[PDB]
From a paper:
During bacterial cell growth, hydrolases cleave peptide cross-links between strands of the peptidoglycan sacculus to allow new strand insertion. The [name] carboxyl-terminal processing protease (CTP) [name] regulates some of these hydrolases by degrading them. [name] assembles as an inactive hexamer composed of a trimer-of-dimers, but its lipoprotein binding partner [name] activates [name] by an unknown mechanism. [name] has an N-terminal adaptor domain that binds to [name], and a C-terminal superhelical tetratricopeptide repeat domain.
The [name] density in the [name]–[name] EM map thickens in the middle of the [name] region, suggesting that the [name] domain may fluctuate in multiple conformations. Therefore, we performed a heterogeneous refinement leading to two [name]–[name] EM maps. As expected, the two [name] hexamers in the two 3D maps are superimposable but the two [name] supercoils are wide apart, with one supercoil in a higher position remote to the front [name] and the other in a lower position proximal to the front [name]. We next performed focused refinement in the top one-third region of the two maps and derived two local EM maps at around 4 Å resolution. We found that in these two local structures, the [name] adaptor domain (H1–H6) binds to [name] in essentially the same binding mode, and the difference between the two structures is limited to the [name] [name] domain, which is 44 Å and 18 Å, respectively, above the front [name]. However, both conformations were in complex with active [name], implying that the two positions of the superhelical [name] domain have no effect on the allosteric activation mechanism. To bring the C-termini of these substrates to the [name] substrate binding tunnel, the [name] domain of [name] needs to be configured flexibly to accommodate the substrates with different sizes.
Residue numbers in the entry:
A (entry chain C): 44 to 575
B (entry chain A): 38 to 375, 411 to 436
C (entry chain E): 193 to 268, 276 to 326, 350 to 436
D (entry chain B): 38 to 371, 410 to 436
Write the structure that this text describes.
Amino acid sequence: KYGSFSEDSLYSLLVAELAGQRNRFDIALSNYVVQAQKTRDPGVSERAFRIAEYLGADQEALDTSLLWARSAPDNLDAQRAAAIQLARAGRYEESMVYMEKVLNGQGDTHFDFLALSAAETDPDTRAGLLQSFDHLLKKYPNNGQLLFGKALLLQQDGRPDEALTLLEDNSASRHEVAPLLLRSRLLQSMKRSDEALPLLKAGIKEHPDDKRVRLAYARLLVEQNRLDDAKAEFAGLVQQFPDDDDLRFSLALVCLEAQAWDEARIYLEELVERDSHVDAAHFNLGRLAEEQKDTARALDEYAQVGPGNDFLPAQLRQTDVLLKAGRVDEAAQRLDKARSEQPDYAIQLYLIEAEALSNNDQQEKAWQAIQEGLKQYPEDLNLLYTRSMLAEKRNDLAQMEKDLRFVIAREPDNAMALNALGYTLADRTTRYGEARELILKAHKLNPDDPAILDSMGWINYRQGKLADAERYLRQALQRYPDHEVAAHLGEVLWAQGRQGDARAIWREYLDKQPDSDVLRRTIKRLTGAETP
Amino acid sequence: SAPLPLDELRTFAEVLDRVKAAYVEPVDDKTLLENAIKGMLSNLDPHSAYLGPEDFAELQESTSGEFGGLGIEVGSEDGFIKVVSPIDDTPAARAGIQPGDLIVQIDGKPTKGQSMTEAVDSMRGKAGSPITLTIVRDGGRPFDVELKRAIIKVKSVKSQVLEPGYAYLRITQFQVNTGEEVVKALNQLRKDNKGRLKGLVLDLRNNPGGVLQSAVEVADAFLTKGLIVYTKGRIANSELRFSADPADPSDKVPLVVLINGGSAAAAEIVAGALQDQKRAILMGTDSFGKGSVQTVLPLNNDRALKLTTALYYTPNGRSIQAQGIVPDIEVGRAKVTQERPQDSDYQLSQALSLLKGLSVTRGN
Amino acid sequence: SVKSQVLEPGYAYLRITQFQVNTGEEVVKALNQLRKDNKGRLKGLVLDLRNNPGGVLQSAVEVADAFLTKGLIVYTELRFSADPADPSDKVPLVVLINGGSAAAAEIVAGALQDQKRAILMGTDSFGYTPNGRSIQAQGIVPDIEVGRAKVTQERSSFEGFKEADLQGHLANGNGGADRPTGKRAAPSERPQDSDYQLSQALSLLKGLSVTRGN
Amino acid sequence: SAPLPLDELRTFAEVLDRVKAAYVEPVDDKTLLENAIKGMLSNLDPHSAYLGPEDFAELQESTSGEFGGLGIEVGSEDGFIKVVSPIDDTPAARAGIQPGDLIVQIDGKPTKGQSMTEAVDSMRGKAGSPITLTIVRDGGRPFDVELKRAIIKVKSVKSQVLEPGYAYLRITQFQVNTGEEVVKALNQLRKDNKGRLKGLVLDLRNNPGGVLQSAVEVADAFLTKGLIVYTKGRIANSELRFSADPADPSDKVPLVVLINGGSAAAAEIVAGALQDQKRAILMGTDSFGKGSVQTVLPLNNDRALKLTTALYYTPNGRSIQAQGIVPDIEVGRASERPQDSDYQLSQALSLLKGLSVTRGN
């Protein structure tokens, strides 16, 4: 009925469990694993496996799991645990074998872990597992979770059409949860929501109790840009179960995106009261304040945002709103204290303020801020770029030239600094060789960046040759159509003596934006007339 | 990083191996480990000991008087069953059972040839199980009575009136309900005398013990204020203090406590609380001198070890462990040569005389 | 005359056989030597006035005043006041009357009963007191009546074992010694052990000394 | 194979640590483990016990013998130290004690929950010292019995003659030399009788028994053939047996053994062998039944434990343990000559006389 203890086995187990009670679990695990390997009885092996899982030693975990599985093959739990551990060990077709053993004894199975680790698995081993799963399907066409696994394999390969069609063929597969969620993901991959919405609604009908299908339907509706249906679905989800916090956050985000400020504000206020994910809650409260035009709430909500990823964008938005709404003194002092709180954030916020002041077209405060930043942290390259921009605004090329030269020396492989320096120098300086070689070095270091080809075309027009300038501007357009590239094209047309072509070229961009600032600046620079 | 007893456990394992190898009767590991546990608990100290499933159930039924059965206290002598008493609130009285009735078969099992323990075991059974009794009355033809087994509570406390104005209260054993039992007994004794109680005598002779809470409750029922008992142990959870509430049904009536050599921890708690508080005058022989509070710690398979966790102290601070309480008036068992219990019992007569004298010299 | 046997550490027994001349000296010396035997503290002084026909009135009044402080002890045109002088030291008192205290002992017992200082336990006397009540006419009704009798203890075949006996018991909390289950013979059969009346008096005195106060 | 009982080991470890945690006093686990060993050795088998290394050391060289004893052999039954037999010719014998009495309390310490080894050791004491112990006899209430202990030496075999051709050979206790003395006494009686005896009533009662070798020696001294006793036990070396050579000093004399309620292993074994070999007949109260063989074996760390390695068996296969011996005829016990002082002896002598007269030899 019950086996017997050899003396050493009893000694080992006793000392192991005593140590475990004293929490010296290392001795417990070592002794238990050794005794499990020796006796191979189900009890010792299972206890050792549980201890290892609690601690989490992958090698010992797998050894004990497989030994337990061998000791009591009849038990389903041992087989599934061994399969899971073996999958965690990178050996996957053997885990599939153990999962077949599980399926022999009908019960719960976890094939999503297999599929995910296959996604982690290398492409050659991925193909090996693909053929193994095909063999399983030939052996076991009934199962749907292997279908999910093969569909995930195909998605990792990039052709989910076959597996998606096979899954849709089976009504039972269409009626389950994981296949439906995978179908939604695949549809998003191929981007056809017209079929995701109906099938997702059919799944909602099949089992509305579950949350994953409804959440996927809400995400697909958000993709569809429809707002009323998404809001109704979110409200129904909350009424069915308001417990989930992620559901509430997604609800608030969709409410904000749907132009529903009152209900979104209610959700954000209750989230803040819960004080969970409060930074984003205050960020969205400030956003709906902007939508309400109230500057006090908009700035105070962003000020209340705790440090985090959303705080710095929120701080920048607060600075922009404050500068728009006046009250320069209070905004400046609040920003200064917030910066003095942390120097690493101080440099970024000072740069933000200096750039905002430069954009607003004021001189004294912008120069004050930039010079303060340079004095405190002169070695930062962003401060050097800001000083160069301020110099360009001041109409003096010396400071910008020196700052960009030092930046270029600092980074031999940089290209943005080289292109900016070349473009500005050709804008100001009469000589073109310096800017020409700067842009040439920039192109050699990085020719793909659109600004590089933009500056290249500018300098080539400055040189006086047409073919190279036109080809470089065409390349810049190919990388990205930019208004500066078209401006240099119009400049080339001007220098070649045809005014109609440049007239139409700038007319196109005027049609792009009736009151574009850069277009007007370039027109006053080139045409020299009020009426182009 | 306290070291573990490696060599000690090695000796233990060697002992187990040699015992399983050399013993005559094959013994499975289950029995040996059970015996080792019982050994630890028994040899640690006298009272502490392991509890088996059936023994744990026995203890639970002892502490809580509610037990499965019919509720008839009997004694088997000369091969015939004597009905000592059919307890109240039971079908026994409603079944016409009378003292001395000759029960011949319990559930059809003859009552002859059985020992007292065997007869008690056979009579007892699972709660709610119907029981058929074949009874021979005056040697006539037997008759069958069907009854339903139920929960019967045993009245721990018995109260009576000795002489007009003097009442007697005996505590057979301390049980969970003993507190309410004492409260109601005091209330009914007080109303019986129409308000005034001249003198009260309490008896704790041969009281093996019981649940501590009941003893503290009784002491509170006989004390207006003060702290009853505090228990100290090396574990914080056991460290405790129990004190009396302002409520006192006694109404400041003279009290005399009898402590015999058989009065144990639970009763000694009440004795010490009533003595060190100068509320009652102990008399009799020295007590059992047992000081300890034991906790039963539930375990799997409903066999829970009971272990002495802490030592209690009298309110003054002296510990009665191993020395006990010396009664103020050490009156021993004796016979005096020149339905009243006092005449037969010498100690009760002495206590009644002392209370009479105290009340008279009070002139109230 | 005076016989002073200490019964317990706190309770001492004084007996007056005959009221000879100047028994005040003997009784006060007995009280003093008793106080020294008890370090100057008493719990109760059972004054056994039994089988004592009496003696000179003056000595009896002297004893009474030795036990009393105020009030008029005895009046027949004669009185006897009480000066505070008293070696009694305010001790609870239990006087015993066996029905054989005729004249003087009876007067002492009656005076102590009336002035409330003491308590009369034994039987009614065979035979004035400060209150209007006489002595020779009605005798002296005792407050608590206890018929004289004898008491004998029976041998214990087996001795209940204390926790000192059980091997490996637990030492007491305060670390004091644990009383074993020994057996030592008493010095002799004390009067408390023999006569029921004196045992009753000692028990009542102990009960009073305990319950009366701390 | 069968699964291991790991659940119970988990339970035991949990209980050990919990007890360490929640006791009145801090108790180191060494004492707890020692108590566990003692219990695992005591609860199952009362006679067996755990002898620590110092216990084994002192057992190797016991005391010089200056401390006498009470001459009482006790067998722990149902948690009560039960006096299996008070050896004759001893203050225990002189005082009133009978086999089957329970010594519940000795010297004021209750014996329930106390192993027999420490009880008997405490009983041992200095020569001529007083001691009192309680007795619960035949269910009667306890009664203190005070007696003086002193070193006791008892002649193993005492012989006598009742009537022409009949002699009575009491065996007080089995000693190492008991065989030689028994043979000598039998020869003396044979020579005194001038001829083959008419039957030698053998009185093996109130005999705590002794060295088994002596019992085998006596049995063979009466018995010419067969196997007197064989011991069986789980260990391979347990199997043992004895046999009787044809040498028959008994001179084919008729025999009638007596068995009171205080006959122990050795006497049990000899009486059972004689009965089961049809060489005699028994009459008296059933034997106590003790037939275990407590043996001391070491394990390690210079210590050893005493355990019942094997148990005896009479030749006809009857288990001398748990059954005692049932005499083929029964009788209850109830200057004066030995044949008249006790009823059992009278019955035995009369029955033997009748048998011898009827047979005619």
